[PDB]
Design a binder for this molecule. Sequence first.
Ligand code: NA
Ligand code: NA
Ligand code: NA
Lengths: 292, 290
Amino acid sequence: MAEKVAVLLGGTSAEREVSLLSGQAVLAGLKEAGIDAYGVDTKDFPVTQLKEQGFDKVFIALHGRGGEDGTLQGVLEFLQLPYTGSGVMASALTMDKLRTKLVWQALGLPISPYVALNRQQFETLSPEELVACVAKLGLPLIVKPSHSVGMSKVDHASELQKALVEAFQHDSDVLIEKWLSGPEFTVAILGDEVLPSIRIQPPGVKTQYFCPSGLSDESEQQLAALALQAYHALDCSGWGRVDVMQDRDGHFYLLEVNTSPGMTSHSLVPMAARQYGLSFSQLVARILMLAD
Amino acid sequence: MAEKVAVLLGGTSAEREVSLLSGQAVLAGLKEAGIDAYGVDTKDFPVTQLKEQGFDKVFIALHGRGGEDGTLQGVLEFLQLPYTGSGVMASALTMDKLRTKLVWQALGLPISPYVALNRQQFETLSPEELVACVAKLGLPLIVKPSHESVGMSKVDHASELQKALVEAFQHDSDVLIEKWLSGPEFTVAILGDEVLPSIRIQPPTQYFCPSGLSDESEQQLAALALQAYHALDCSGWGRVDVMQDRDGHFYLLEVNTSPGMTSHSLVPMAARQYGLSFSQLVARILMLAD
Ligand code: NA
Ligand code: NA
Ligand code: NA
C-alpha cells in the first residue's frame, strides 16, 4: 500500500546541471517527509521502464526539452503512472509562445500588443512592407522565435530586418512585440493557492530576487488573480509559475507559464513558498499530494 | 538496409475495430509501394519497445485515446522514432474543443457562437441563471463536454438544458454550449501542404465528393481549412471538419489528427478524387515523417 516514488532528475537537456540540483533537493525534501522516494537520473535510466522498476508515482524535476514539454508526460500517461505538474496538453502548449498568447488573448487577458509572422509572409514581403506591418506597435520592439536564443531589441525601423533574419533561423513562427519597461514578476501556483509574487532584477554586468515584491497590496491582489486565470486558461494543474511583466503605466502583461520550475535552494518557487510559510519539505510533499 | 516501418494498429481504445481495418489497409498500401512494413497490434505489443525491436519509422493508424491525443506521440518522441501525423502539442490540443476554439477565435477564424461553463459556475448557478447565460445563442443548442458521442445532446427547449448540463458534467469539468447550425457539413483532408477535395456529408449516411460547392466556395473552404490546421500546429496530415449556416458561411468544428484509413473512410475518398491510389496516399503520409 505505501507508494514508491521516482524523482526524475538530470536528463539530457541543456538544463541538466540545474535539474540534478532540483532533483537532489526534492529527493531530500521528500525523504524528510517520510516518502519512499528514489532518485532516477533519466540520462541513464529510460523513463519507459519506470513501471517495470516498481514505481507507483512520479515527481518530475527535469527542466526543458523532454521534461516540461509534454513528451515525458505522454510516456507517463501511456504507463498510467500519476505524476506531478501539468498534463500533456498544458506542458506542451506552454512551450509555444504564439499559441499561449492566442488563448490568453481570446479570453481577454492582457498581453503585450504584437504581430506574428510565419515563414511564407517573411519570404513574400519586402523589408518596407514588414516595417509597415509592425508600425502600430511603435518602438522599441522585441523580436523572438515562437518556441532562450534568437531574441533582439529593435530600437528603430531599419534594425527590424536583421532581427527577423536571426529569429527565422530557429523557427518558422516569429513574434514581434511592443517593448515593455518592466520590471518582471513571477507568481508561483500550488494547487489552487497563489503564492507571493517575486520581483526579478536581471543582471546588467548576479540576478536579484525580491520577495516581498514591493507592490502595493491592491497591485498584488490583481496580479495574483491574473496569474491564476492565466494558469487555468492553459489547463495547468498541480503546480507551476506564471511570469508577468509590468509596463510604464503599471499594468501587468502575461509572458509565459513554466510547467516544471526550478527547485534548487536558490530557485523561485521555494523562495515564494518560504515566504508563504512553507518549508521546502512541505512544498514538495504538497506537490506530490496533488498528483493522483 | 531499407527502413523497417511499424504500422501501429488496433490498440485498446473504443475505436479498436476501426483501427484494425485502417491498419490492415495501410499495411497493404505501404507494401504495394515498396516499403518494408510490418503490422503491430499495440494491444499485444508495447509501443515502448518499438526501437528495441528494430523499427526505424512509425505509421500511426490507431484512433482515439492513446492514438491521436498526444500520449503515443510523446512515447515516440522519447524513443526518437519518426512518425506520421501531428506532434504532441497539436495532437493533444485538437482533443480540447474549448482551447481549439479559443485559438481559432483569436486568429479571427469563424466559429459558431458558444458559451463555455466550468464546474464552479455549474454548482454556483440556478437552472434559470444558466438558461439566461445561454439565451443569446437561441435554440436549438448543442451541449457537450470540452474533451471527447459520450455526453453530448441537442437541447430543443430551455427546459431541457439542465438535464443536458448534468449529463455533460459527468465526463468533464468544462462544458460547451453551442448554437445549432443548419448545415451541411464538410470535411477537408490535408496532406502535407496540399488540400484535397472536400467531401459533403449528409446525415440520414451519405458522402458526396465532389462536394457540390462552386469553384470559388471550394477555394475559400480550402484556404480556410489550411488556416485552421496550421493554427493548431498540425503537420503531416489530418482532416478538418467544417459546417455551413443557412446563409452559406463556413464555421470550423474540429481537426482530427489520426483519421480513419479503411477502404470506406473519408481521407481515402478525397485522395481517390484527387487522383491518388490508396497506396500512393499512405506512401505520401509516410514520406512526410522525418
Ligand atoms: Na511546459
Ligand atoms: Na488529436
Ligand atoms: Na455574409
